[PDB]
Amino acid sequence: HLVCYLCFYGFMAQIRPGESFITPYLLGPDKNFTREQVTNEITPVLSYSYLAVLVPVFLLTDYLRYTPVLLLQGLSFVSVWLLLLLGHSVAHMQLMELFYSVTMAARIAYSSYIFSLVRPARYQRVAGYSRAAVLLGVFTSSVLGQLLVTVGRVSFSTLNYISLAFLTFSVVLALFLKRPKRSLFFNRDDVLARMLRELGDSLRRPQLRLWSLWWVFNSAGYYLVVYYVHILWNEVDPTTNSARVYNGAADAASTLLGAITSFAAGFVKIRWARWSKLLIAGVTATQAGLVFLLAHTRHPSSIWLCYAAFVLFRGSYQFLVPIATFQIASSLSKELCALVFGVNTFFATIVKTIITFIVSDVRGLGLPVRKQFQLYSVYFLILSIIYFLGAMLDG
CATH class of the missing domain: 1.20.1250.20 (MFS general substrate transporter like domains)
Incomplete structure (x- = not known):
């Protein structure tokens, strides 16, 4: 049961109920941030951090193989949702943006994960299954967030707690299997x-x-x-x-x-x-x-x-x-x-x-x-x- 667990992990790594309400949460009666503050100070930090983390992380995914990078992505999401709930300053939100940029930079590992994992002559079917699982996970994430905001009248604080529970469960599921080889760049066996x-x-x-x-x-x-x-x-x-x-x-x-x-x-x-x-x-x-x-x-x-x-x-x-x-x-x-x-x-x-x-x-x-x-x-x-x-x- 190797193909079934990759799809289960692809689905249950995208949930994060409350990723669409982060900005309403910051600009609300809980964090008490102003729109000028949020925009001008916090949001630019995402781009600089994205560049800074993007340049290393592409080479650290080859060398270490994708399992450490997926663990790092899970822990970065946990850090983001721990800084969201715990934190009242602007530097805390800039750290949140740095960790979020780490997650976005590491988001480019699951495809190469699957490619190097599966086996040839089996790669396309498993890739098509996992591309459908990720999209379904992302869709269910937003549908659950909106159904838990409107139909059930919970606040924006409890969405973050539910997201934290889901993120911890994802990090637990993030064990999965590791290779002896990548065949790309560093962990090859041995031109173009x-x-x-x-x-x-x-x-x-x-x-x-x-x-x-x-x-x-x-x-x-x-x-x-x-x-x-x-x-x-x-x-x-x-x-x-x-x-x-x-x-x-x-x-x-x-x-x-x-x-x-x-x-x-x-x-x-x-x-x-x-x-x-x-x-x-x-x-x-x-x-x-x-x-x-x-x-x-x-x-x-x-x-x-x-x-x-x-x-x-x-x-x-x-x-x-x-x-x-x-x-x-x-x-x-x-x-x-x-x-x-x-x-x-x-x-x-x-x-x-x-x-x-x-x-x-x-x-x-x-x-x-x-x-x-x-x-x-x-x-x-x-x-x-x-x-x-x-x-x-x-x-």
């Missing part, structure tokens, strides 16, 4: 023309230099919007009642829409790529027009548009991720694709850090959330214009 004539021949491809730049810049913008969105739903509707906050429902709907849209972008990935710049232009223009709707909504009774303009914003980004991944990793080996997808992520985080320092940090411009979203919409518009001009030049 040194993987160097390899990535040279790889970079000599028009379709690999087109989706990598998309990856970098559009992922930077996407993650900025995702990070700062929850501080904008509080500006619109400052409700002190924890029974009319639908962050969990919004995230559950976003997860369903992303899974529907990624399945739909499985037919048009070998076709519909002769116009791989008209697609990017259209989707980026839609994303630019949705962040404008987010930034131009002020009435407290029009919050249904802010919840629904984020669901479509995440759904439109998950359309091109399967298409970008297939075109980037099409003539690559398995050892070089993992390096290319890490180089793209590092460069996206560099841009995120630069923009965050310039705009959001108090040692930069220090702008409120609405002005930040205006600048983000302008950013997406510029990318859409550039891509449309390139596509027109193609014809």
Whole structure:
């Protein structure tokens, strides 16, 4: 029973009921944080910490094999939810953001875990099972959070206790099995023309230099919007009642829409790529027009548009991720694709850090959330214009 335990662990490692209400919890009658404090001081710390931990942790997952890294991720989640409940300062919340960044950086280990674990000629079925288990766990997480906030009238303090119980159970389940080999990088048994004539021949491809730049810049913008969105739903509707906050429902709907849209972008990935710049232009223009709707909504009774303009914003980004991944990793080996997808992520985080320092940090411009979203919409518009001009030049 090896395949059954990996799916059980993939499901019961995503629960964390109350990950969608962290921002309402900080901006509430318990922590008593102000929106300026939260945004400008606490949220930039996520990006710097993400860069700082991301650079080491990719090499510490190869060397140690994935079991120590998954244990570290579980303990980091436990630390995050211990700093959430216990803590009343800003430095405590910045430590919380450092640990959360550690979790995000280590979140890139389960796929390689499974790949090196299963066995060939069995890898695809087990990978498909585990990719479905993780999505179901994430969906059930938000559905349980929203059903425990609204239907059952518990406060935001008890959600964190339930989350802590689930996290402890996950760390207990985090024992699982370890390898004698990785076959990637360090724990091999023993090239790719040194993987160097390899990535040279790889970079000599028009379709690999087109989706990598998309990856970098559009992922930077996407993650900025995702990070700062929850501080904008509080500006619109400052409700002190924890029974009319639908962050969990919004995230559950976003997860369903992303899974529907990624399945739909499985037919048009070998076709519909002769116009791989008209697609990017259209989707980026839609994303630019949705962040404008987010930034131009002020009435407290029009919050249904802010919840629904984020669901479509995440759904439109998950359309091109399967298409970008297939075109980037099409003539690559398995050892070089993992390096290319890490180089793209590092460069996206560099841009995120630069923009965050310039705009959001108090040692930069220090702008409120609405002005930040205006600048983000302008950013997406510029990318859409550039891509449309390139596509027109193609014809």
